[PDB]
Every structure is written in structure tokens, then in C-alpha cells.
Amino acid sequence: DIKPRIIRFGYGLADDSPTGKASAHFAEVVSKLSDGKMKVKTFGNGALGPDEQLINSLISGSGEITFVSTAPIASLIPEFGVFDLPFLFDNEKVADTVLDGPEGKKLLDKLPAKGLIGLNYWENGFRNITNSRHEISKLDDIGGIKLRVMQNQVALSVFKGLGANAIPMPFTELFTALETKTVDGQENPLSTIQTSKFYEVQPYLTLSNHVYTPFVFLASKKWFDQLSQDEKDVITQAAADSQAFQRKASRQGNEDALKYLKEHNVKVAEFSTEEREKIREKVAPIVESLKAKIGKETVEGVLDAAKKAS
């Protein structure tokens, strides 16, 4: 029961990013599993707008598939704000375990009420601080830095508490704001810093790995529900295949990215063990207040699953 369909897949990152190549890989798998009847068209690099617009496109049905960071979803479902808390996951293996486990599914299950199907989680990654004003190797260096953040009360509160002037902006506007120094800097994973070319206008990189961002791989519930079960099965099966492809490609891209940023002579700093301690204690009281905005059951449950995974 598989009829010809044309399926629109917009996203924010560059086509050459690991997740952009995973998007093409998803397109290829969907076609294979449907004998060429289901054809995914990808529109990368923000061609169909930033995350916030992609989410709305899926709700309304102008788009079929996207991947977005969890932060913008907090505007619909506050519990998704949990992943903007710093230092939640020690490594990617903890993240996978938690996201693919009951605490991750509890959140994905909140999406149909809002018109969305969370097919699964993909990896955006550990985020690192880039700027153009000065090296950031100490908590103190963050003070008064005009830092773009993702558009969520949790991101804004955390970085304001670390002393920065936190400027929420959509990702599609970020490059020009860095280039024009309307903002001093930003924080993203290395392979995004590379493939969106932020390093061209950001001479400083700090390997802070301060937050882990999941992507949600999403379908429009309106569109998905009118598929036949055989058609749904092509999508979910392709999504499981692409999740594994995406996570491997993300991790390898993270390694290639640091080399390219290094071998390209970007100035890379780290936070000391001590400075990282200072960071955690500055954020502690703010994380505690944000629980009320996120959802105390979600924060505590994610922390407990992270602990057992770890």
C-alpha cells in the first residue's frame, strides 16, 4: 500500500554538515524502501526558514519532515527546555541512553497534541563558545560578552547568569550578526561552527562543551496520519536507519571539525578544571530556579536516567 508521494524536508544547517548528509541519507533510504515511489526533497541551509518556521510548517502541513533543536520546541512544550541545562550529560553514550530511553520517549510523546510526530532523536551535539572580542578561558572572560543564544527562556537565563549579554536570535540570522559584530559570539558544536563558516568571523574558540543539544527528527502529524501503514513503516524504518547514520556521522564530523579548525589556525582555548568548577557553581542556583519553568518531574527524571546511564 505505497502510492507516489513527494515529501519536503527543510532544515537549517548547511547541506555539507553531518546532519545535512544524514538528511540526504534519509532521502535515499525512503526511496529504496518504497521502490522509488516516495521521493524526499531536501532544502538545506535555511532555504525553508529557521527551526521556528519549520516547526510551524509541519504543524500546518506546508512541510512534511524536519530536524530541529529541542530549544525552539520549548516554546510549545516547556519540558523540552530541560536540554538547555548545562552539564546534563557527561558524554554522548549517556545522551543516547537517556534520549532513547523512557525519559526521552516521555518528551517525544508530548508532540502529537501539538501536531508533531517525534520519529526519534538525532545528535546536534556538545556546544562550544565562539567569539570575536577576546579569548575565553575563564568564567570571568564571559562577562558582558554579547552572546547569541537559542530562543528559549532557559538558554537566555543560563548565559545571563554566566554574565553574558544573551541575545536570542534564530540560527538563520547568525552568520551576518557575527560578521557585522552585532553580536560578539555564539555557541554551537564544532561541525556547525565549521560548516556554517562561523570560524571565518570568529577568531576565538573555547572547548567548553557546556550543553548537549538533541535534535528531534520530526514529521507533520497531519501528513503522517494520512499515510498508509505501509507508508508510515517506510518513514519510521528510514528514520531508525538514519538516526544511526547521523550519530556516527556527527561524532566523526566533530573530530574532523576540530582538526580543520586547528589545522586552519583558529585560536582554541579550554576551561580549566578549576574554571569549570566555578562555572558549575555560578549556574547551580539558576538551574534550580529554572526547574519551575521546565517541569520538575522532567528535570529530575532526566538527571536520574543520566546518573544510571553513567
Ligand X SMILES: O=C(O)[C@H](O)[C@H](O)[C@H](O)[C@@H](O)CO
Going by the annotation, the residues of the binding site for L-galactonate are 12-13, 51, 69, 124, 127, 148, 188
Position with the least CB separation from ligand X: 12
Q: Which residues contact 35 (CB under 8 A, 6 or more apart)?
A: 2
Cα–Cα–Cα angle for 13, 234, 5, rounded to 5 degrees = 75
Among positions 10, 12, 214, 253, the unique one binding ligand X when judged by CB under 6 A: 12
Q: Please enumerate, by residue number, every residue annotated as part of a binding site.
A: 12-13, 51, 69, 124, 127, 148, 188
Task: Determine, following the binding rule CB under 6 A, whether residue 11 of this chain makes contact with ligand X.
Answer: yes
Q: Which residues contact 188 (CB under 8 A, 6 or more apart)?
A: 127, 128, 130, 196, 198
**Closest CB 50 distance from ligand X, rounded Å:** 6
Among positions 128, 132, 213, 246, the unique one binding ligand X when judged by CB under 6 A: 213
What CA dihedral angle connects 193, 197, 202 and 205, to 10 degrees?
Answer: 30
**Closest CB 150 distance from ligand X, rounded Å:** 5
Among positions 9, 26, 171, 198, the unique one binding ligand X when judged by CB under 6 A: 171
The C-alpha atoms of residue 199 and residue 128 are separated, in whole angstroms, by 12
The amino acid occupying position 12 is G
Among positions 7, 150, 167, 190, the unique one binding ligand X when judged by CB under 6 A: 150
**Closest CB 149 distance from ligand X, rounded Å:** 8
Task: Determine, following the binding rule CB under 6 A, whether residue 188 of this chain makes contact with ligand X.
Answer: yes
Q: Label residue 3 exposed, middle or buried (CB < 10 Å: 0-12, 13-18, 19+).
A: exposed
By the criterion CB under 6 A, which residues form the site for ligand X? 11-13, 50-51, 68-69, 124, 150, 171, 188, 213
